[PDB]
Amino acid sequence: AMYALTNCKIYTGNDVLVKHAVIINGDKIEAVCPIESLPSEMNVVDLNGANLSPGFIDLQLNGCGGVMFNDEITAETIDTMHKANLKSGCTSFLPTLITSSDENMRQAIAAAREYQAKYPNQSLGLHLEGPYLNVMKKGIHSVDFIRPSDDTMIDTICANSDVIAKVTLAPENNKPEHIEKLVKAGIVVSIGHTNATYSEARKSFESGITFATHLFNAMTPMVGREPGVVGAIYDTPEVYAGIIADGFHVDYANIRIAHKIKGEKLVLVTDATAPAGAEMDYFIFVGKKVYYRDGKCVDENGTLGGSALTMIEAVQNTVEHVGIALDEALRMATLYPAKAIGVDEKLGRIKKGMIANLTVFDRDFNVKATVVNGQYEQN
Amino acid sequence: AMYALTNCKIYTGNDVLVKHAVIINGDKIEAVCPIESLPSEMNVVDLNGANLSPGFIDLQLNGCGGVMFNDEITAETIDTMHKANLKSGCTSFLPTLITSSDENMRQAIAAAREYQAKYPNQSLGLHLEGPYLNVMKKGIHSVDFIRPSDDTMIDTICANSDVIAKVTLAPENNKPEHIEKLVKAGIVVSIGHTNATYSEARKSFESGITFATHLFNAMTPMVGREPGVVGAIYDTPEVYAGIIADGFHVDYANIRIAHKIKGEKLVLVTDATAPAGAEMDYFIFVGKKVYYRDGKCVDENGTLGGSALTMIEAVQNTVEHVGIALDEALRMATLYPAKAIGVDEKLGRIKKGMIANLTVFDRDFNVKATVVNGQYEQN
Numbered sequence: 105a106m107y108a109l110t111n112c113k114i115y116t117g118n119d120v121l122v123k124h125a126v127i128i129n130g131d132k133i134e135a136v137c138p139i140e141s142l143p144s145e146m147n148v149v150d151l152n153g154a155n156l157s158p159g160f161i162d163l164q165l166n167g168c169g170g171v172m173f174n175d176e177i178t179a180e181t182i183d184t185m186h187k188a189n190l191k192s193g194c195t196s197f198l199p200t201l202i203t204s205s206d207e208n209m210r211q212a213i214a215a216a217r218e219y220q221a222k223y224p225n226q227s228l229g230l231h232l233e234g235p236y237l238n239v240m241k242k243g244i245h246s247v248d249f250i251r252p253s254d255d256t257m258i259d260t261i262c263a264n265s266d267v268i269a270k271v272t273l274a275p276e277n278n279k280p281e282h283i284e285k286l287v288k289a290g291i292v293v294s295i296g297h298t299n300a301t302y303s304e305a306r307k308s309f310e311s312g313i314t315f316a317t318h319l320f321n322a323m324t325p326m327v328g329r330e331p332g333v334v335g336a337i338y339d340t341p342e343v344y345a346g347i348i349a350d351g352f353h354v355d356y357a358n359i360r361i362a363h364k365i366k367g368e369k370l371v372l373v374t375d376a377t378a379p380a381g382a383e384m385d386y387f388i389f390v391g392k393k394v395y396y397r398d399g400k401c402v403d404e405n406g407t408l409g410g411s412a413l414t415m416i417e418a419v420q421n422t423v424e425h426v427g428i429a430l431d432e433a434l435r436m437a438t439l440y441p442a443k444a445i446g447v448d449e450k451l452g453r454i455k456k457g458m459i460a461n462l463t464v465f466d467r468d469f470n471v472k473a474t475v476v477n478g479q480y481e482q483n
Numbered sequence: 484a485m486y487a488l489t490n491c492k493i494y495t496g497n498d499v500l501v502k503h504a505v506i507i508n509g510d511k512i513e514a515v516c517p518i519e520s521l522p523s524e525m526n527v528v529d530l531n532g533a534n535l536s537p538g539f540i541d542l543q544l545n546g547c548g549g550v551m552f553n554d555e556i557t558a559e560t561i562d563t564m565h566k567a568n569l570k571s572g573c574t575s576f577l578p579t580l581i582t583s584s585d586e587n588m589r590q591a592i593a594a595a596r597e598y599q600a601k602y603p604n605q606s607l608g609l610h611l612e613g614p615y616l617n618v619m620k621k622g623i624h625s626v627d628f629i630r631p632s633d634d635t636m637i638d639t640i641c642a643n644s645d646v647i648a649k650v651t652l653a654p655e656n657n658k659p660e661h662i663e664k665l666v667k668a669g670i671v672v673s674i675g676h677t678n679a680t681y682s683e684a685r686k687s688f689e690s691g692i693t694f695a696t697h698l699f700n701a702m703t704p705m706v707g708r709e710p711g712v713v714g715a716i717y718d719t720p721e722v723y724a725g726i727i728a729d730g731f732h733v734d735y736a737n738i739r740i741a742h743k744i745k746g747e748k749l750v751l752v753t754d755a756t757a758p759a760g761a762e763m764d765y766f767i768f769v770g771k772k773v774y775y776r777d778g779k780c781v782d783e784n785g786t787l788g789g790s791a792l793t794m795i796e797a798v799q800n801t802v803e804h805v806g807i808a809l810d811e812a813l814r815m816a817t818l819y820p821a822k823a824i825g826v827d828e829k830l831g832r833i834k835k836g837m838i839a840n841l842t843v844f845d846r847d848f849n850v851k852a853t854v855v856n857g858q859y860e861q862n
């Protein structure tokens with residue numbers, strides 16, 4: 105049957121709504137209408153004054169709730185991740201596989217294909233972060249697998265674009281043609297783990313790169329005579345940029361500045377790993393031990409190795425520490441990520457016709473429930 | 484006698500006027516009015532379709548037209564600079580003394596007093612760049628003279644505020660009380676040649692710093708976990724930043740980014756040395772000799788050695804390479820600097836009752852003439 109979510113503040117993406125309701129029908133949003141407009145017969149889930157927004161979309165998520173995608177490359181891993189996400193309001197995500205072997209890349213593609221043939225609008229496709237990086241900005245990435253982009257695997261990726269949302273790579277020393285082919289196959293291409301100058305990064309935007317992976321991390325910073333990759337991102341309006349707001353990856357003052365420059369091009373990601381939503385001392389990250397240490401994820405050397413952030417926390421830290429308004433924070437965690445991967449016509453807003461993927465959260469930012477394809481599940 | 488500047492495009496700082504004129508009476512702008520409104524028997528100077536604008540205010544000038552100020556610390560040197568300034572549209576400036584001995588600072592104070600006693604609104608005050616810097620970002624400043632700030636010299640600096648417009652220091656390891664004292668005396672305090680964290684930089688703005696000296700040069704830059712000084716300037720509305728637009732000190736894409744962030748607060752400065760508006764092939768400066776190679780300043784290694792920029796060129800570079808509009812660029816050379824040192828009541832604008840300091844330049848940015856306290860003099 106149809107039902108209506110009721111008694112809540114609703115953040116549609118365009119308007120903050122009081123004394124209205126949202127009518128769900130199947131997998132879809134039927135209507136957002138005033139509460140007095142609601143049919144007498146209609147079933148009601150009453151949300152006790154909490155916030156309602158579209159479900160969060162996480163564009164960079166390596167693992168969570170105890171598991172890692174790189175380590176157990178299966179549909180069931182993706183499945184486990186999806187369910188842990190729900191605890192922190194995240195309804196969609198790109199399962200992210202960092203630098204590894206060709207065989208691992210073929211396994212992930214299969215796994216994505218498997219999971220998505222069963223469930224829609226949850227995993228929105230692979231994010232291949234690596235392996236075509238620059239060894240100098242490797243962070244946690246494996247020195248054994250970082251390699252130049254090659255024609256064969258690039259062709260494989262293109263051929264499987266129906267399960268592949270995004271590729272992060274370093275363009276300085278890789279073939280421009282490979283960018284073009286990926287873009288031509290409808291995969292989103294992102295600069296990251298790159299030692300490019302401002303010029304080279306500009307060149308790769310002209311080639312089709314439209315995204316930047318974790319602004320400020322594993323990229324040439326802005327200095328007086330070399331704007332670098334950071335400057336290029338600040339100077340190119342078409343480029344989205346993901347940014348991690350755990351308080352450890354990037355100083356909040358920088359997130360604030362970035363938002364004033366980037367506005368709707370700034371996107372909240374987690375880059376989260378197995379400890380996000382799980383209690384653990386360390387995890388494996390492609391034969392690397394990564395340790396959980398007072399909220400951070402670090403290797404033996406203190407290099408950060410993803411995060412333990414969740415999407416709800418990223419919204420909150422952004423409101424509370426960065427100084428950004430709530431409705432805008434939510435947009436950075438929903439609508440803007442959706443626009444960046446070209447799913448915004450079905451996800452990222454509360455409006456009629458679109459898919460019922462929603463999150464409810466109280467004033468203290470506790471996620472109380474989600475809707476996923478119309479299905480309401482309490483926390 | 485009254486006369487009118489005529490057959491020009493006028494850039495008042497608020498509006499761009501066609502088919503108007505400016506009336507000069509003595510040393511004041513009388514009125515800005517349609518040409519048709521001119522008393523038929525008034526003397527007119529036909530400017531031949533040139534651009535008319537307030538004279539350029541350079542807030543950082545170490546020397547030019549052949550001489551360095553630190554070399555000959557006299558009212559005579561200040562006057563050689565002024566006369567060279569006029570050739571490139573600059574009608575007011577801050578004679579800038581770099582870090583030296585107390586004795587030299589006393590001479591500098593005296594040379595400015597004597598000059599300003601004779602002429603007004605040309606030198607608008609001494610700028611002390613140093614000596615209270617940070618050795619770790621010393622650049623060309625002498626290690627033997629860079630020292631903490633001390634009550635005695637601070638007390639004398641204050642005692643002469645009538646002749647000192649500005650002091651650049653590094654605040655991170657000097658006394659806050661000292662900043663307070665200087666600001667209280669109506670001296671502008673600028674952060675510069677510093678190794679301050681963002682936190683330190685913010686503390687200094689709190690204590691009264693309202694300016695930053697040559698943004699991106701000799702300061703702590705903006706990296707992911709450490710916003711630095713560049714970051715603090717970006718995050719503080721009150722703080723003006725001077726910037727050198729020669730194409731060598733700071734990449735043009737960085738100036739574009741900074742303007743978008745800072746607007747009204749971004750000021751064009753030359754920071755010029757001897758070669759500016761002079762024919763030289765080198766100049767010795769406090770020991771090291773620096774060559775003048777095709778409009779660039781280099782030590783025998785080919786490393787940047789200082790600036791030869793003029794204000795009219797700064798403006799042209801800003802229009803032409805940064806992408807900023809003519810009127811806005813003009814504002815960055817006139818109104819904005821004027822406001823930063825608190826002289827906007829009299830200067831930086833073509834308006835009734837304000838001092839007649841004006842610059843006329845053609846479409847090719849060739850200065851054709853200026854007007855200083857009402858006196859028209861062709862180039």
Ligand SMILES: O=P(O)(O)OC[C@H]1O[C@@](O)(CO)[C@@H](O)[C@@H]1O
Pocket residue numbers: 242243244245318320321322323353375407408409410707708
């Ligand atoms: O380049 P930065 O500022 O040192 O940080 C790099 C960040 O990117 C990574 O997440 C990628 O491995 C970590 O290396 C770290 O968190």
Ligand code: NI
Pocket residue numbers: 233243318322
């Ligand atoms: Ni990474």
Ligand code: NI
Pocket residue numbers: 612622676697701
């Ligand atoms: Ni300097």
